[PDB]
Design a protein around this ligand. Sequence first.
Ligand SMILES: Nc1nc2c(ncn2[C@@H]2O[C@H](COP(=O)(O)O)[C@@H](O)[C@H]2O)c(=O)[nH]1
Ligand SMILES: Nc1nc2c(ncn2[C@@H]2O[C@H](CO)[C@@H](O)[C@H]2O)c(=O)[nH]1
Lengths: 436, 437, 437, 437
Amino acid sequence: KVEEILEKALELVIPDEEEVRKGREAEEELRRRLDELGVEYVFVGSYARNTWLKGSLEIDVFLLFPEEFSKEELRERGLEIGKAVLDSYEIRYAEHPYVHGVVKGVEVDVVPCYKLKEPKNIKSAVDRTPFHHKWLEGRIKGKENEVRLLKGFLKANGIYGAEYKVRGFSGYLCELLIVFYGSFLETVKNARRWTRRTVIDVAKGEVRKGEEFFVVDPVDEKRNVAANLSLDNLARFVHLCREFMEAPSLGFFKPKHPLEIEPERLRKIVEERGTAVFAVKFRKPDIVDDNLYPQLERASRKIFEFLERENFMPLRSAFKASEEFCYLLFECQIKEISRVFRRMGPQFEDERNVKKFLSRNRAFRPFIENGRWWAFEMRKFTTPEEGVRSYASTHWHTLGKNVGESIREYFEIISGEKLFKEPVTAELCEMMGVKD
Amino acid sequence: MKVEEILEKALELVIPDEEEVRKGREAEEELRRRLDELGVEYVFVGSYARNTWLKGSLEIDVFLLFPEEFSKEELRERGLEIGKAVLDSYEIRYAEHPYVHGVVKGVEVDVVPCYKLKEPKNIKSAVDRTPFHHKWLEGRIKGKENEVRLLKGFLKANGIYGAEYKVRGFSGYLCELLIVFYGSFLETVKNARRWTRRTVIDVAKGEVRKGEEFFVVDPVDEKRNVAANLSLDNLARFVHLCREFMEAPSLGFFKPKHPLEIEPERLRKIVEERGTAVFAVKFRKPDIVDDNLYPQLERASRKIFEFLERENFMPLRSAFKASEEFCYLLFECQIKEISRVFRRMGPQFEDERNVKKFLSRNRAFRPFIENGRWWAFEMRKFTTPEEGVRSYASTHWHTLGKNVGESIREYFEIISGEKLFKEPVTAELCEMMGVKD
Amino acid sequence: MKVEEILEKALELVIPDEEEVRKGREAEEELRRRLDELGVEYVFVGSYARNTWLKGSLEIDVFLLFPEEFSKEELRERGLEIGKAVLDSYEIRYAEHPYVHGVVKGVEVDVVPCYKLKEPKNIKSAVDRTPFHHKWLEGRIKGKENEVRLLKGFLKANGIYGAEYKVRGFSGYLCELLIVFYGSFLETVKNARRWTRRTVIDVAKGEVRKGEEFFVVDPVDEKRNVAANLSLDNLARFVHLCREFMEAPSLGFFKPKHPLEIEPERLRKIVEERGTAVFAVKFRKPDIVDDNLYPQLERASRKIFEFLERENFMPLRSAFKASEEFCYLLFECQIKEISRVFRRMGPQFEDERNVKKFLSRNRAFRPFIENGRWWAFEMRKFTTPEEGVRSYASTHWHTLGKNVGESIREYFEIISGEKLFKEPVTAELCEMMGVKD
Amino acid sequence: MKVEEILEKALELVIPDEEEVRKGREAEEELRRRLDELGVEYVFVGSYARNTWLKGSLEIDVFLLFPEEFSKEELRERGLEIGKAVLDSYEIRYAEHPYVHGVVKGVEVDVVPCYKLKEPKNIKSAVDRTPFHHKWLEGRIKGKENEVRLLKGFLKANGIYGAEYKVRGFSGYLCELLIVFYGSFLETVKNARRWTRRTVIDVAKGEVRKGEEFFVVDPVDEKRNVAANLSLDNLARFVHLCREFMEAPSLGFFKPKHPLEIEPERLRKIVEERGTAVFAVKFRKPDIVDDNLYPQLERASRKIFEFLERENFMPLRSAFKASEEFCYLLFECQIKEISRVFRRMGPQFEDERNVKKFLSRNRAFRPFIENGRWWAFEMRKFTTPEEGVRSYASTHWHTLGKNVGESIREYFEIISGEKLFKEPVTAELCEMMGVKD
RNA sequence: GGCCGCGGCGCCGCGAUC
RNA sequence: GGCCGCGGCAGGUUCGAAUCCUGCCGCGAUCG
RNA sequence: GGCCGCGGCAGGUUCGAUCCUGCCGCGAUCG
Ligand SMILES: Nc1nc2c(ncn2[C@@H]2O[C@H](COP(=O)(O)O)[C@@H](O)[C@H]2O)c(=O)[nH]1
Ligand SMILES: Nc1nc2c(ncn2[C@@H]2O[C@H](CO)[C@@H](O)[C@H]2O)c(=O)[nH]1
């Protein structure tokens, strides 16, 4: 039965007592250090509401300073306080330079911000986090386990987190959904009837039809909490919910193992497909995931669009970011194209331009077709691999700011059996739909 | 060298020698003698009557004029009786109505029945128009016959003389109107350089204006376009030749180009460098007139071309040739081979019902979501243009024209690779690929 | 009493009652609910969406909008797939694209797939041009829905509403464009009296001018004639009705005419008095839609009518009728019986050879000369119009329309006399002969 | 492994586990409690009472006894009332007579009213025999319950268990009589190898003899055939099964068979190799029980088959499937296409009266004499089996069964070619064509 | 799918119409 | 209620039906 | 800081512009 499955799930989902005592002792000690300095602070985030998922323990503390101190005034000051409270700290750059460190083994964040009267003086996202907490701290009580079930259900299917690496559901969005539908089970049941135009207005407690999938923030009606939830991940979630209800299982809460596959079998698969499968290798820029992945996504789309234009008929693309290198994977229906192509000339009555078009020397004679001139010309490349070698060599600049600059410094085109040796088997299996 | 020198030298290739003219006069006299014996009203029309016929293209046209009171059937009976009774060796041909083609003292002759109309307003049949055409031209073309012959020779040598569907070019009647309008061959070539696809040449009103298509107003019937069957591409070819001519005149324009005759090993080498897929569809030529066959060969080629487009084989050009026995549909494709797998479109994720059906079917690989919609990897039936066309010719033979489609249904085959170079199509392949000498 | 009062009362015959309106509103709401569950882009268009549908003719037209990237096959797959899922008791119909017709909460619904085009130039399909028609009228027709609704009822009551081949009248779209042009039903009727067979009505430019045909310019496409399939005769009828309507306004114009059925005995006496020959060609109705059948019944009757004209049976008028199981081609001729002997045309007296052949034939009677031509007395194969058609229909079945032709080849019979009046054709017979009361 | 171990292992797949028995026992004693409170005559019969129900097919049967002092109308009233006032979640099923079916503490139950009766000399309703059937078996089956279960499982695993019209196999009652007769499952299988279509098994007389048809004599009524609804073909499939089992015993005979799995492309290619015409008649499934639906599908499938034979399309076999919404009638024909023309037999040459009538019809070709009789060429309305069935389904809907025929009268569609392989009927197509894994 | 018109010599092909 | 086998009728197909295609009434059988 | 959507300029492609590419401004998202 479902009720027993969700009970079994709580084991994988709820943090153990040791993890709580580790955080509780880190919290109580973190306060003593903040009280002595006599600074205005507040505990928020998934910890303050006791909704953090198992293994993902993090303490979020916000410093509430007056409105008088503008921008860089409290930035450096709040940063200074973060050092005199944390053990092994390090400066991390978000919208505002905040401080990430550790206190008695537990990771901690210290973000400075304004102390605003109402959510009208909102400047940035950091100014909304306190209001998100204030709105949730009361309503979420007695539903902490419902949140964690949802967070686990999503993280197991790789769609938990609003960061660009995932483009899934935020922890804040999860809690809003539980407050709306009451429980995890009710959320999954109703999600089956979600569409790409569903509007979930939490504050007004109703569901409307809109222009896009829009979860209205109770703090700011103008804001979509699911703004970075991709359309596909929305589609995937709706489907996962449908599958869960038809045949409930604890498997939905356990992560999947990458498809084990021998390079020889993988070769035999590509042969059966008759496609060209290759990858663009290059060194990973030293930048944050929130900057890296949107760029890899761009570089992929750009090369993909180039392959379309050059009539190589690409099927799908993919990318992987390892420790030192990045890979842009492609699969095209055309292994090789004729050297000859057709270049369109002007209409026959346009004598001036026809003369210019015909003046160019070519191996074969131009011709007329539908009252317009045409000419046989030669391609510079006949394979998709050679085409991308050319594109990545001349159009490196449009492949993302940092990714484009790395490709400028170095890149290979790896295909055939040599590709299967690279650590990209998990993604090649995914984009081709290999099953076993 | 000089313009007038070339035009003078061109007349030799284009004017009938005095022997051919004598051959025609002798038949003409005998033909009139046999007709007068029968008490029928006739009229010598066409190229021969106006003395504007091309060298080695002698053919007499005689139209029989009957009262309007006659029925279509009576018109025919009297026509065929008088046809057979005047020609040494006749045969019944068809064109709107039956007429009699035959020979008289070596010279070929056409005897056509039509109504004797006083006003050019009672024109039901097109044959009823010919007497009016001749009537309008016999006076205005006098002195200009050599100019007409030049234009005809210029057009013929460049394969665009004749309004039949095999040529889709300039009719002889059209050539005469052009000379009457412009005054001479040279002046026609000159002004032709500024012809557009919207040019309207109205001889009867003596003006040039703009229209929706290239229109040559018939002086006999202003609603008729004399250049109706002049294709856009052949119009373009003519305008371009006229420019090429005035830029660098030459007697070569009036001579036919000997077909590109190359060996099957060089032809293999050209296709090799082009990197394309060249192949053909061989089948038996239907037993029909060219005016039926060629429009169907066109349709056949177009349909297969459109098929190759849809199937992503990326065709460059198509061509066709007709032997006395067989017919060939030629094609060149940029893709010699395509992958087995392809993307099959599924429903949007919101569809509980259809997504279930879509995912129900068995496939070698997992379907996936993209842009909020399900897609699935499926396999192609064919992976080369040759096999794709083989499949299409077998299943969609009916769309390749009536007579051509039925013939393909009985028997066809895909002659590809080097085996095709042995077939008699090399001249068409070189034209199709733009091969130089 | 006065025109304005008649119209005010005519509105009742024409506007949908509150119950029929609500019937649609409930279907619409349910239809939208189903379409939203599938995430498909759609739009309610046509007569219902603009709230101009005639009383009793409630029909909802939803158009599915797909990207231009979609292949025609994909366009059709998704369309059909969505239709069946949204309609209760669906029925696959065919036009330009295969679409789905069905029922939702007791209301008729059409679901047509098409392309979501931003440019009205990318139009290739007629279903692609519908979404543009709707948007051009959506704002303009607002506040005039009852004026359109009058024009429809006025037309339908006189059997000239609908541009199908069965009616060859005014389309619904045409009706709305005319109200937008003249402002109201009354202004449309008043000006229609001055229409001609050359009148052009430019809606976008809001001006009238002369042309070749009766042309109502589509605001979305200047090249298209909205009143293309409006027959010349139905045009004349509408003009006349408008003139008759203003000279003596009546609510009777907005009401259908009674069947006007008469006893077989009266009809027998009428034909006797007229002294004509009235017969029919009966045959099985081809299993084809009306749009294919009626143009063929028109051709069939026309061809047979022309045969009777050639054979001197002097046809007056013709008509046709399609029942459920059979089809009838009705004819009335002034000659019940013609002489067995007739004149056969021979050669002129000069033609010695052919006169010999002509006079050598065995004949009951001697040939003779008349106006320098030999004539002969020969015997007709048939001597009544029924005999003649029985022949022609069997030896020229192939010209009587494709489907109609093959059905006549399978089976047909010439019905006349008492046995014809028993067939379901009396209404058409009376209309043909101009019987009154 | 060997037979003894196979049957041992089979008991696992066959005997209900202690959890299923407990689920039933608690339901029984509870059901008895409610029958004692009202104080009504009742009896537990059927497979449950004798403890022979197959694994997973748990179903309690309880017959309500009533005195003979009741008419056929009074029994259902206080019969169903006692039924509804005993079952928790009850409904109403319709069989021989109205009866209540519902679930009681997990398991479903049937409450059938009937007369008590003294001896089987009455012989009236079918439900009046069930108590006598149980009484005859309850003593003789004790100690053989597992043998019964082995037979029932052996049959169900091969789709021939159950006397319902959807199966036309062996009834549960029949299975128990056989075990009583032969002593065990293994002895039944051994002797069944020598069964014929004329074998008579008399249980009460303990003898086998030859008769007119396969007949298992009911011990209660010698005139009744217990295996009456066992089809001839299923009897054949059983005799063959037993022979295969004894020749090479295996546990696989007790496990149901795989669903096959085949791709549309292979299925298309197969049909191409057969050179046959495969198509289906698709329509909406009438909302009726299987026992009414399947016999009608058999009738419709048969009627159309006989039509295909009669129309010389030479059908090979026919199959049918019933989904939740639609029903399919599958057919395969050796003739994809037939000539337009055919022969019709006329009268003998002496019969002048009828020769005149026969020769009066308008036909495309001349009739001819052959062996003294007159014959005539005539034209078919259709030339393919698809189109032939389309005509037949349209004009003979009424004979394709009551409910099925009515649903076809409303809507049906002929699905041929590759489009048929998309429908959910691949399993039925593979079985029909004898496609091997 | 059928119908009309155009073009070439009723047979074919192409535009318009439902 | 539906299906099946006979018995008596009533239409349709056909030049013409005891016979081929259908429908109604009566009896028997099967299944729920 | 990066990415995405708009708005306005500027190179390139090309026979010439549809396409490609860059710069500035506004808004959105993530850190
Ligand atoms: N179609 C038709 N066949 C008949 C008719 N009467 C008899 N037959 C059939 O004609 C054939 C010859 O008749 P018989 O000599 O057997 O009486 C037989 O097959 C017989 O059944 C009838 O009225 N119509
Ligand atoms: N009227 C008619 N009788 C036939 C035919 N064939 C056989 N017969 C038989 O011939 C006999 C005529 O007396 C009857 O027994 C008929 O059944 C036929 O084609 N027409």
